[PDB]
């Protein structure tokens, strides 16, 4: 969370939180209800976000759902959408935390090694997460879409 990140930075310089770090925490917690409502709206629309993002991905990356493709066939396609649902869930965790570390620790460390073993093209996984960002953005205010979008963008960038 933003709180852990501030503490870790202070601890590395053997010091109390700066007045600036403390002010950021106060500002974050004051906006806290609005962040929880973003997580609730994305949660309420998770089926729509994952399904519509899947359709967008498969239109731009027909290779992954064609013969030889990692998602080819009903069962592998379903597993592919399960992974997008995992990443949507992690993005809701980042949004309430004000920091990407929960995303990093669950879904990013070792992600290249996992997908390489499975034969999954990780650039297509990134494409699916970018598709979820565009669908999610359609359900949020401009301000809320900008905040949510930063968490999607972190996942896409960490897979590139």
């Amino acid at each position: 969370s933003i709180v852990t990140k501030s503490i870790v930075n202070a601890d590395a310089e053997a010091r109390y939180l700066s007045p600036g770090e403390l002010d950021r925490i106060k500002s974050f917690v004051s906006g806290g209800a609005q962040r929880l409502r973003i997580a609730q709206v994305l949660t309420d629309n998770r089926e729509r976000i994952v399904k519509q993002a899947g359709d967008q991905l498969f239109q731009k990356r027909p290779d992954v759902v064609s013969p030889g493709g990692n998602a080819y066939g009903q069962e592998m396609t379903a597993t592919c959408l399960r992974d997008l649902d995992y990443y949507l869930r992690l993005v809701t965790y980042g949004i309430v935390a004000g920091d990407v570390t929960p995303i990093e620790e669950i879904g990013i460390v070792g992600v290249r090694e996992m997908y390489k073993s499975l034969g999954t093209p990780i650039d297509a996984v990134a494409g699916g997460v970018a598709a979820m960002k565009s669908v999610a953005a359609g359900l949020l205010s401009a301000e809320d879409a900008g905040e949510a979008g930063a968490y999607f963008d972190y996942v896409v960038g960490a897979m590139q």
Partner: protein, 161 residues
């Protein structure tokens, strides 16, 4: 380490769940306390040297511990001891901001008792000094913040026992 936010996330993630009503209510509970935690942290930070000085004066000075043959004799050991008390106050303040004691297990307590035991640092006297830090801190941050800080001071003391 975890804080009150990552504790809720970790509890949801191990069950594979999106944040439900209970998770969102628990996060709201922490966000509603955040300014009070920041207020207490600002007061402690501004008074950190004075808190340790008063705790030392009430619990350690003018005793066998500071005289020749005591563990706080020599400027090097006196300075190491007040450095340890500076660490306990700084880490308890982090734990209070986080609303979670896990930073204490990871960054303070892991092998600490065994280290004190191998060096001959008196653990009883250390816990009495921590108890004095708790009472001086409480006098500055007020009863509610003093009780919350006392959870983390008690956690360090228990971990030394």
């Amino acid at each position: 380490m975890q804080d009150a936010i990552t504790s809720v996330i970790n509890s949801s993630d191990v069950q594979g769940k999106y944040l439900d009503n209970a998770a969102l209510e628990k996060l709201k509970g922490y966000f509603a306390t955040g300014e009070l935690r920041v207020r207490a942290a600002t007061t402690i930070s501004a008074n950190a040297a004075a808190i340790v000085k008063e705790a030392v004066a009430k619990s350690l000075l003018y005793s066998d511990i500071t005289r020749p043959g005591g563990n706080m004799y020599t400027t090097r050991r006196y300075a190491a001891c007040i450095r340890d008390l500076d660490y306990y106050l700084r880490y308890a303040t982090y734990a209070m901001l986080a609303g979670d004691p896990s930073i204490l297990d990871e960054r303070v307590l892991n092998g600490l008792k065994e280290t004190y035991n191998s060096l001959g640092v008196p653990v009883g006297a250390t816990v009495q000094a921590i108890q004095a830090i708790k009472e001086v801190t409480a006098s500055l941050v007020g009863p509610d913040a003093g009780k919350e800080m006392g959870v983390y001071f008690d956690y360090i003391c228990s971990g030394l026992s």
